[PDB]
């Protein structure tokens, strides 16, 4: 028997001590080795309730990622609280590794095995575990990258559906790759991302239909972000240490939801040295990008959406890409987990 509680978690990883890659280095000092024989007990005839939007596991992961980035990605210039801090800014090796979050003695993690569980409500199917699955700390906006897929159906996630101020997480049940490349050889900050139109539009169509199920079969329309910082209006992520900003206009194409637009989709991108820190602490300036082919291939496994408020007589609903938290990224991976206290 068990009871709901919050406590300080620890982390585990398979980080290599000889590796200079910053996630490896951090985890070597801040985390323990993984368990090769992890226990998982299915809780027979037990129903447990979850709430991904009120889950202290999420807040704790954010702290770690903030801490990781702060000691690993020193900029040449940092603009924070009106102050400027300078230090050395060598190019680094950067590639996220899976991190498991685990409970200490007297506590355990409950896992919801409901395939179509939406992150809020009751879960009949529950298994206890010592540690979560390995979650890569991928920091991004609009699109969730290299993250777990829905087992069965596409799931729409939101703290409240009726409310428009609450971010919507679309959990994909099938990956779509992103290939971003800064070619070796003009403009060293010029880049692009290639996506498969046929595959993506098939998925996007399904997401539209899924959304229809939740909004009284109203018409679903995608539009580009109304405004804001470049970090949210564009697809923002970190690739091999370089901060990428990718235009997503082409990805949310209404007319393709079909003509011969089944070919490769190429998003225009730029690498920026001066950025707004996702930590919310201000602005940082980095050195210009390394030479040669900068390339990251990533699955698209989630989408962040904001719905337009004020629909009236018109039955349409408009959605725009971009989430309003980095915590939501971790939320999407931790939605099926919660900490409880053992009696």
């Amino acid at each position: 028997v068990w009871k709901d509680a919050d406590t300080t978690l620890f982390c585990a990883s398979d980080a290599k001590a000889h590796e200079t890659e910053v996630h490896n280095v951090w985890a070597t000092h801040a985390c323990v080795p993984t368990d090769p024989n992890p226990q998982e007990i299915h809780l027979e005839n037990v129903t447990e309730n979850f709430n991904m939007w009120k889950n202290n596991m999420v807040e704790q992961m954010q702290e770690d990622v903030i801490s990781l980035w702060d000691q690993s990605l020193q900029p040449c210039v940092k603009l924070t609280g009106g102050s400027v801090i300078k230090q050395a800014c060598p190019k680094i090796s950067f590639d996220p590794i899976p991190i498991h979050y685990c409970t200490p003695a007297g506590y355990v993690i409950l896992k919801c095995n409901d395939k179509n569980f939406n992150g809020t409500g009751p879960c009949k199917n529950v298994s206890s575990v010592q540690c979560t699955h390995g979650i890569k700390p991928v920091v991004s906006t609009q699109l969730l990258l290299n993250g777990s897929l829905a087992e069965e159906e596409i799931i729409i996630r939101s703290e409240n559906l009726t409310n428009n101020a609450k971010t919507i997480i679309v959990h994909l049940n099938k990956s779509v790759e992103i290939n971003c490349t800064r070619p070796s050889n003009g403009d060293i900050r010029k880049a692009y991302c290639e996506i498969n139109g046929t595959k993506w539009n098939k998925v996007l169509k399904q997401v539209t239909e899924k959304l229809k199920e939740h909004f009284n079969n109203k018409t679903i329309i995608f539009q580009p972000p109304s405004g804001g910082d470049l970090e949210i209006t564009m697809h923002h992520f970190n690739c091999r240490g370089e901060f990428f900003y990718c235009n997503t206009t082409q990805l949310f194409n209404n007319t393709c939801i079909m003509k011969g637009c089944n070919g490769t989709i190429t998003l225009p991108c730029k690498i920026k040295q001066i950025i707004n820190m996702w930590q919310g602490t201000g602005q940082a300036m980095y050195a210009p990008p390394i030479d040669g082919k900068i390339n990251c291939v990533s699955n698209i496994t989630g989408i962040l959406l904001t719905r337009d408020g004020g629909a009236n007589n018109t039955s349409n609903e408009t959605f725009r890409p971009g989430g309003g938290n980095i915590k939501d990224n971790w939320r999407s991976e931790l939605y099926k987990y919660k900490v409880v206290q053992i009696e």
Partner: antibody, heavy 120, light 104 residues
Framework: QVQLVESGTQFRRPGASVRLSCEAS????????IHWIRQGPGQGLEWMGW????????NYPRRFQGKVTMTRDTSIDTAYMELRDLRSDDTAMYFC?????????????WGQGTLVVVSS | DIQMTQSPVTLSASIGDRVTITCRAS??????VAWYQQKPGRAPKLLIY???ILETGVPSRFSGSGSGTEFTLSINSLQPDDVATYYC?????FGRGTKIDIKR
């Protein structure tokens, strides 16, 4: 006390644009969404949109889309709403708005209002 | 997709009397609602939130209730200072407004 203090009443000529400011104090500017609402003379309240201070995220209703622009200044805790292509029917009282309650953006605290008069 | 309708459009009552304002929600499903007081040539003031919870600094005579479609704002004993326009609210939607008027 949570407080929003907006700029004084403005006078513009049709076709021109206006920029309205909202100075926040008494709370963490970053913590909650900022909304804008307009009141026609002898009329009800109309929601114009909301803005997120940390990343500048913006939401607009169908009617004000393309006609309204919301901007933020994090360093001075001041929010802005810019209205363009001003019309005679844009003459109204505009309010910058924020939420007193934690975790609930919708409950609101009202700024004293900024009257915008559009005349040639 | 939710619309708020207030009744009555105008409400005329004597001092010391109980006053009730009705707000109806089209969507049919809600648990949260706010009420506001607005005096002439003055900004609105939050009175009630979460349907039945009083804002700080608001007199005890003010109460809120209601479930589902219908919500009500009640004044236990009307005071001359309460004469103003009152609005209800659900998310981005407001009611048309009711003007409390001193009856003669």
């Amino acid at each position: 006390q949570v407080q929003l203090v907006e700029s004084g009443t403005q006078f513009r000529r049709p076709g021109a644009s206006v920029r309205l400011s909202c100075e926040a104090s008494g709370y963490t500017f970053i913590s909650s969404f900022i909304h804008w609402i307009r009141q026609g003379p002898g009329q009800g309240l109309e929601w114009m949109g909301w803005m997120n201070p940390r990343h500048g995220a913006v939401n607009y209703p169908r009617r004000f889309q393309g006609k309204v622009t919301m901007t933020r200044d994090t360093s001075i805790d001041t929010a802005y709403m810019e209205l363009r292509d001003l019309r005679s029917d844009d003459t109204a009282m505009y309010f910058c708005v924020t939420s007193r309650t934690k975790d609930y953006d919708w409950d609101f605290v009202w700024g004293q209002g900024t009257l915008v008069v559009v005349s040639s | 997709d939710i619309q708020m309708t207030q009744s009555p459009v105008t409400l005329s009552a004597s001092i010391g009397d109980r006053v009730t304002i009705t707000c109806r929600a089209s969507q049919r499903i809600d648990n949260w609602v706010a009420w506001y007081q607005q005096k002439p040539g003055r900004a609105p003031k939050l009175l009630i939130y979460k349907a039945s919870i009083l804002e700080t600094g608001v007199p005890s005579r003010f109460s809120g209730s209601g479930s589902g479609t219908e919500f009500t704002l009640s004044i236990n004993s009307l005071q001359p200072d309460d004469v103003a326009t009152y609005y209800c609210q659900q998310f981005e939607e407001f009611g048309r407004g009711t003007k409390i008027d001193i009856k003669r």
